[PDB]
Scaffold this motif. Structure first.
Motif, PDB file in Angstrom:
ATOM      1  N   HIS A   1      -6.124  -8.796   0.259  1.00 31.42           N
ATOM      2  CA  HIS A   1      -6.517  -7.101   0.342  1.00 31.42           C
ATOM      3  C   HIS A   1      -5.645  -6.974   1.853  1.00 31.42           C
ATOM      4  CE1 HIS A   1      -8.709  -5.958  -3.058  1.00 31.42           C
ATOM      5  NE2 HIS A   1      -9.241  -7.065  -2.984  1.00 31.42           N
TER       6      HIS A   1
ATOM      7  N   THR B   1      -5.079  -2.219   0.609  1.00 35.25           N
ATOM      8  CA  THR B   1      -4.249  -2.321  -0.743  1.00 35.25           C
ATOM      9  C   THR B   1      -4.036  -3.891  -1.104  1.00 35.25           C
ATOM     10  OG1 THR B   1      -2.472  -0.835   0.596  1.00 35.25           O
ATOM     11  CG2 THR B   1      -1.515  -2.356  -1.042  1.00 35.25           C
TER      12      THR B   1
ATOM     13  N   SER C   1      -1.974  -1.746  -6.982  1.00 36.93           N
ATOM     14  CA  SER C   1      -1.593  -2.757  -6.404  1.00 36.93           C
ATOM     15  C   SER C   1       0.059  -3.109  -6.077  1.00 36.93           C
ATOM     16  CB  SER C   1      -1.977  -4.155  -7.264  1.00 36.93           C
ATOM     17  OG  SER C   1      -1.228  -4.279  -8.496  1.00 36.93           O
TER      18      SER C   1
ATOM     19  N   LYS D   1       5.445  -1.690  -6.753  1.00 38.38           N
ATOM     20  CA  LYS D   1       3.915  -1.243  -6.767  1.00 38.38           C
ATOM     21  C   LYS D   1       3.642  -0.791  -8.252  1.00 38.38           C
ATOM     22  CE  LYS D   1       3.079   2.581  -4.276  1.00 38.38           C
ATOM     23  NZ  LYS D   1       2.847   3.908  -3.599  1.00 38.38           N
TER      24      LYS D   1
END
Lengths: 194, 194
Positions: free
Chosen positions: A73, A78, A40, A35
């Motif tokens: 995505h 995310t 992202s 992370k």
């Protein structure tokens, strides 16, 4: 140039991703889920039997890495990056250092004697590879004409040990050795030929 | 960060294409078809009413440009790049010059006072934009966290005229002014905020 050289030019001029103090979410021993502080997530593979980070969940890492395919995505929103190699510890040097590149082109030493600057203690060999070859492409014309399609780079450490790569082929990710302490690099040299 | 900032980070860390002494095949006055010396063809658009190169067939140009979509191979095997802006004359300076970036981050002047080096007389403003912002992302963390999502860069010429861009938005290609003589840049400054 031929298509494999155009593929090399594409790879080395497609940029790279730099993230600092990312958090390990999962280490699957050959791949990692990380992370980044922008929110992202990086999914990074480690194909080498010699370089397989062992950082566990919650530890912090730095990323200086290349994407293997377009980021996507998820339905939850995310953003996921798909990368290869380039994970190191977060240790920093007090001030940045330059890794000057001594470059010979068609047997002639270039007058350009500069290199990229870094404030990290450790860099993966693949990171050094793309930084070196990016400079060779951009400034010295590597892969941009049929006369500049091969050669090598060679890193020599203060203790005499070396690392090297053949410019005529893609970096050997499958046998990448572990990251090195850049403050102990003595010289980086490269030659371009064709 | 939000998705538009992730889009900016992607754009500014996706690399760029540098070609020298390419040949104009066709100039359609707002777009150009150019043959690079590696054999690839660049199709480059110029959306600005203020920057529209007039080089005609057979003339030589330099490219320092960004791709707008993935390059593709034709049935005949020709590799085609799709780019935007970044076409200049081929005039060179005798030795490269550095365009140091004076950077302030959260109101504090950074000690890193270096910049990219170029041996071309002229660079498009869009080229300067991506070189500046690439350095800001890579070294100063621009777009990598919610606290570094805006600011500006400003170029001041020796004669006092200026160029500027807002870091919170994509470069304004639609109003890009013509290329500048980099040897007459006095200062380049940037500030990052959030």
């Amino acid at each position: 140039t031929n298509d494999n050289i155009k593929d090399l030019l594409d790879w080395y001029s497609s940029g790279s991703d730099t993230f600092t103090n990312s958090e390990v979410l999962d280490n699957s021993l050959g791949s990692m889920r990380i992370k980044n502080t922008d929110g992202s997530i990086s999914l990074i593979i480690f194909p080498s039997p010699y370089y397989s980070p062992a950082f566990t969940k919650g530890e912090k890492v730095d990323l200086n890495t290349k994407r293997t395919k377009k980021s996507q995505h998820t339905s939850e929103g995310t953003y996921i990056h798909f990368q290869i190699s380039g994970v190191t510890n977060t240790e920093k040097l007090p001030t940045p250092i330059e890794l000057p590149l001594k470059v010979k082109v068609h047997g002639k030493d270039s007058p350009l004697k500069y290199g990229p600057k870094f404030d990290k203690k450790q860099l993966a060999i693949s990171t050094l590879d793309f930084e070196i070859r990016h400079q060779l492409t951009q400034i010295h014309g590597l892969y941009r004409s049929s006369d500049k399609t091969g050669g090598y780079w060679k890193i020599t450490m203060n203790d005499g040990s070396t690392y090297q790569s053949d410019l005529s082929k893609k970096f050997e990710y499958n046998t990448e050795k572990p990251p090195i302490n850049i403050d102990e690099i003595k010289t980086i040299e490269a030659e371009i030929n064709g």
